[PDB]
Amino acid sequence: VNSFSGYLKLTDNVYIKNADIVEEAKKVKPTVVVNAANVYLKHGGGVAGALNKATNNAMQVESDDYIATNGPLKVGGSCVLSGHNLAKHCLHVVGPNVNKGEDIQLLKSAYENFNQHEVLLAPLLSAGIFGADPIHSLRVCVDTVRTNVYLAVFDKNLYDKLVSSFL
Ligand SMILES: O=C(O)C[C@H](NC(=O)c1ncnc2[nH]cnc12)c1ccccc1
């Protein structure tokens, strides 16, 4: 038993809610919150800007040190950093950004990072301003992630569309 509330059940391991991931994290304090990061860990907008703002820019400061030491991530890759005031850890996962012309096939590789963690609070990778088809991304999530994932969808109309079309 865990502490998430009001989530709709989709498969053996995936739950979904129309919610602000920042507020879900502040409430649950999950072991792992997933950030929809880019390879430079420049947290400007979307999930990343929202999470970083909620940490008072501490996420960005930590991320800049990470990049200075290690260089950029790969599209499809991830790193584990602090969750600051939101979670124990933040798993920064880079899905492909269709608005940058990146390869949508890399979405499955991106979701595979979730399997290294027993339970996660996460956004829908590559959706929103990342420009991929969100129905396709939810499908890839359910068909790739085997650990317990609690998906937070910000946009109400999107959430309703995703639930109503889920197979
Ligand atoms: O779920 C959605 O609608 C799409 C989702 N975007 C957000 O979650 C989001 N965006 C902006 N500001 C926010 N403040 C709280 N959540 C926020 C997203 C998924 C993947 C990559 C980029 C964005």
For the domain that residue 122 is a member of, what is the CATH number?
3.40.220.10
Method for structure elucidation: X-ray
Alpha carbon distance 144, 164 (integer Å): 21
What the block records as the tokens of 48 is: 């990343």
Within-domain flag for 2? no
Residues 27-40 as b or e (16 or more Cβ within 10 Å = b): ebebbbbbbbbbbe
What the block records as the tokens of 130 is: 């990342």
CA Rg, the chain, in Å?
14
Number of independent structural domains in the chain: 1
What the block records as the tokens of 19 is: 């919610």
What the block records as the tokens of 120 is: 């996660």
Please, are residues 50 and 20 in contact by the beta-carbon 8 Å criterion?
Answer: yes
If one counts every other C-beta atom within 10 angstroms of the C-beta of residue 152, the result is 25
Within-domain flag for 3? no
Within-domain flag for 33? yes
**Residue 154 beta carbon below 6 angstroms from any ligand 1 atom:** yes
**Residue 124 beta carbon below 6 angstroms from any ligand 1 atom:** yes
Cβ-in-10-Å burial (0-12, 13-18, 19+) of 131 comes to middle
Report the SS3 class of residue 117.
coil
Beta strand residue intervals within the chain, DSSP E: 8-9, 14-18, 32-36, 78-82, 89-93, 119-122, 148-153
Which protein residue's CA is at the shortest distance from atom 14 of ligand 1?
Answer: 50
**Residue 22 beta carbon below 6 angstroms from any ligand 1 atom:** yes
Instruction: Tell me which residue range forms the domain holding 138.
Output: 8-163
List, comma-separated, the residues after which the chain is broken, a break being a C to N distance over 2.5 A; otherwise answer none: none
Amino acid found at 165: S
